[PDB]
């Protein structure tokens, strides 16, 4: 048993809305966290380029969770200097915030960004840290037992966001 919250079209509209919001708020480098966060950052960069006309750099931080979910940073690949620049971390599902914390720490170690923002496709609540997203595709109230999973063509061969019961 699962419930589809966002289909492919809903994901597309959310990503397009986020791209527009980013453009409006910032007149920037996108850095994905988690496997799907990285694919989402690449989609957002493509949307921003199609809207604004100029290239958007995409980097990634490679992070893995472990059960205090202590996520470890394996490595980071950001192809340009982030010092004095605005970086927007891109996440698929904002939950406890522990992966985002790890990503922020990785960024402040590789450079001195002027600011770090956070864009997420879904925010399911239940933060365990004082972390909030600046851009959100869809807020989804969830119980602590439910799981939220994003499927993307690049990894799962389909685009969908679904909620599952314990």
Binding residues for substrate, by number, are 35-36, 91-99, 124, 148
> Which of the residues 108 through 127 are near a second copy (CB under 8 A)?
108, 112-118, 127
100 binds a second copy (CB under 8 A): yes
- Write the interaction track for Sm ion spanning residues 120-159; mark x where CB under 5 A is met and - where it is not: ---------------------------------x-----x
Strand, helix or coil at 139? strand
Cα-based angle 148, 94, 3 (whole degrees, multiple of 5): 20
Considering only the stretches 40-48, 98-106, 146-154, 155-163, report the one whose residues sit in contact with a second copy under the rule CB under 8 A.
98-106
148 binds a second copy (CB under 8 A): no
Spatial separation of the C-alpha atoms in residues 124 and 122, rounded to whole Å = 6
> Which of the residues 36 through 95 are near a second copy (CB under 8 A)?
68, 70, 83-84, 89
Q: Which residue is nearest to Sm ion (CB)?
A: 159
Closest to Sm ion by CB, 70 vs 153, is: 153
Cα-based angle 38, 44, 49 (whole degrees, multiple of 5): 130
The answer for residues whose C-beta is within 8 angstroms of residue 155's C-beta and 6 or more apart is 35, 36, 39
Residue 151 pairs with which residues in a beta bridge? 160
**In Å, how far are 45, 47, 150 from 53, measured between CA atoms?**
11, 10, 29
Q: Which residues bind a second copy (CB under 8 A)?
A: 68, 70, 83-84, 89, 100-101, 104-105, 108, 112-118, 127-134
Sites of contact with Sm ion (CB under 5 A): 153, 159
């Amino acid at each position: 048993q699962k419930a589809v919250i966002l289909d492919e079209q809903a994901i597309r509209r959310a990503l397009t809305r986020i791209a527009h919001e980013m453009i409006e708020r910032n007149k920037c480098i996108l850095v994905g966290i988690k496997t799907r966060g990285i694919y989402l950052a690449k989609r957002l960069a493509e949307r921003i380029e199609q809207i604004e006309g100029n290239p958007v750099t995409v980097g990634e931080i490679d992070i893995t969770l472990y059960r205090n979910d202590e996520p470890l940073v394996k490595g980071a690949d950001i192809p340009v200097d982030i010092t004095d620049q605005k970086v927007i971390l891109v996440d698929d599902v904002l939950y406890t915030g522990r992966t985002v914390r790890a990503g922020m720490d990785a960024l402040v170690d590789v450079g001195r960004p002027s600011s770090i923002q956070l864009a997420v496709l879904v925010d399911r609540g239940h933060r365990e840290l004082p972390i909030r997203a600046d851009y959100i595709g869809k807020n989804i109230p969830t119980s602590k037992s439910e799981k939220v999973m994003v499927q993307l063509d690049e990894v799962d061969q389909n685009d969908l966001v679904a909620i599952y019961e314990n």
